[PDB]
Amino acid sequence: LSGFTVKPVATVYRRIPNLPDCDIDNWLNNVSVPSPLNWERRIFSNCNF
Amino acid sequence: TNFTIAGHEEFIQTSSPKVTIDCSAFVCSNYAACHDLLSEYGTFCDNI
């Protein structure tokens, strides 16, 4: 008769990130709150968000 | 004038290992979309 298979209700995903971890999006939550006088700006290049 | 007795062995094959094949686990093991197309061929795996 016909067979059977274990029910695959789980999944596993692993993958090495190509670009390095950015970890710069926390710049908006620093302790030095800027002002409209200076309003310092930081550029993001080669990052992942 | 003088004689002796010699020996000799011989092997004759008689049996063979029995192999069974299933289509439900070969082409369409655990995929439902595979079984839909396999049923189109009809009585093709029942002959095997």
From Swiss-Prot, chain B:
Glycans are attached at residue 2. It comes from the Viruses. Mediates fusion of the virion and cellular membranes by acting as a class I viral fusion protein. Under the current model, the protein has at least three conformational states: pre-fusion native state, pre-hairpin intermediate state, and post-fusion hairpin state. During viral and target cell membrane fusion, the coiled coil regions (heptad repeats) assume a trimer-of-hairpins structure, positioning the fusion peptide in close proximity to the C-terminal region of the ectodomain. This is Spike protein S2. It comes from Human coronavirus HKU1 (isolate N5) (HCoV-HKU1). The chain holds residues 792 to 839 of 1351 of the full protein.
